[PDB]
Amino acid sequence: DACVHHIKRRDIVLKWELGEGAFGKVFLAECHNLLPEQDKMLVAVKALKSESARQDFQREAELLTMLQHQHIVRFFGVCTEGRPLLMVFEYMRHGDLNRFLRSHGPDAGGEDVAPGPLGLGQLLAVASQVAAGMVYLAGLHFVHRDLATRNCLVGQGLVVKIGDFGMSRDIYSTDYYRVGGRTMLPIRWMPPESILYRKFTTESDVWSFGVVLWEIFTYGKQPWYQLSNTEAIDCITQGRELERPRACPPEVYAIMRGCWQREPQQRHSIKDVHARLQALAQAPPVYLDVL
Ligand SMILES: Cc1cn(-c2cc(NC(=O)c3cc4cc(c3C)C#Cc3cnc5ccc(nn35)C(=O)NCCCCCCCO4)cc(C(F)(F)F)c2)cn1
Numbered sequence: 001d002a003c004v005h006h007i008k009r010r011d012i013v014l015k016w017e018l019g020e021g022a023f024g025k026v027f028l029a030e031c032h033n034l035l036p037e038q039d040k041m042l043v044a045v046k047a048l049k050s051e052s053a054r055q056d057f058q059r060e061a062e063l064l065t066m067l068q069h070q071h072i073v074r075f076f077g078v079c080t081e082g083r084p085l086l087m088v089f090e091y092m093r094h095g096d097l098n099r100f101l102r103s104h105g106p107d108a109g110g111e112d113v114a115p116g117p118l119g120l121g122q123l124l125a126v127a128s129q130v131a132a133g134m135v136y137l138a139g140l141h142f143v144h145r146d147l148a149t150r151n152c153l154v155g156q157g158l159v160v161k162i163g164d165f166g167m168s169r170d171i172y173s174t175d176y177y178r179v180g181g182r183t184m185l186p187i188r189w190m191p192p193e194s195i196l197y198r199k200f201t202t203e204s205d206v207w208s209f210g211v212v213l214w215e216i217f218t219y220g221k222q223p224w225y226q227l228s229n230t231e232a233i234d235c236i237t238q239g240r241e242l243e244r245p246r247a248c249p250p251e252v253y254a255i256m257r258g259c260w261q262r263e264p265q266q267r268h269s270i271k272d273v274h275a276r277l278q279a280l281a282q283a284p285p286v287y288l289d290v291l
């Protein structure tokens with residue numbers, strides 16, 4: 001049921017590689033006649049590799065065209081015209097959110113970003129945008145299962161959008177727990193009911209967002225980095241919480257804990273978390289200076 005848009009291979013011109021995963025690589029490419037205002041624009045093309053993949057390929061592209069929001073990474077279509085199989089994405093020049101945060105933690109000044117550490121309003125801006133994307137998926141009633149900064153992209157103008165890599169399992173292999181197995185769980189981002197009861201719901205995503213929110217104010221630092229995977233599981237199932245980041249106001253840390261209520265339905269909705277963050281984000285400097 002291909003209701004997903006298609007792109008002729010001839011309109012796609014690979015320039016160079018951006019990154020690589022076990023199951024695929026990403027290229028920067030020129031895409032002609034894709035958008036009307038740009039006769040030529042830049043896209044990020046993912047090439048695959050398997051009959052399991054060619055069948056899997058269709059499923060994700062259906063999903064990707066399906067969820068299109070202002071804070072979900074734009075998905076233009078696919079090139080099924082012969083092989084290799086391609087997926088055409090909007091190009092986000094600042095890379096994933098984790099790299100971006102780490103590059104602007106203390107300790108340069110560029111086109112989109114002020115010199116040195118990201119400001120409180122900027123840190124809040126980044127968090128607000130991710131929330132909105134999670135608000136969208138929650139309305140669509142989808143669960144991300146792997147919400148982390150490594151799966152969020154930053155675009156020119158400091159635009160943050162949600163994606164689901166990758167890539168993530170490869171470049172950030174230290175962020176996953178290998179179960180034998182043979183799968184991998186980002187245990188440091190998962191709530192107690194997911195580690196114990198193996199349940200992943202919408203209210204499991206707010207827990208993930210708090211950890212993402214934690215990540216943002218720690219400038220990309222891994223949660224429970226001082227702990228091993230087994231030791232991390234212990235702390236999480238025993239109700240121990242991540243300490244307040246230095247760059248995090250007591251007002252904002254209260255939001256994290258609201259996402260970290262042990263019982264799934266005692267947590268706040270993602271609509272409610274986004275609203276508090278956006279207000280803080282849009283808040284006048286005067287209000288934030290004394291925060
Ligand atoms: C089971 C299941 C999963 N999903 C599901 C899958 C996805 N797919 C991806 O997230 C995805 C996947 C991927 C690339 C991109 C993305 C976006 C991009 C990119 C991109 C655009 N500009 C740049 C600039 C630099 C770099 N990358 N980019 C860079 O430095 N890249 C690093 C290169 C790593 C190479 C490995 C290839 C990884 O392959 C999204 C969602 C959802 F819903 F979130 F949108 C859901 C649905 N069902």
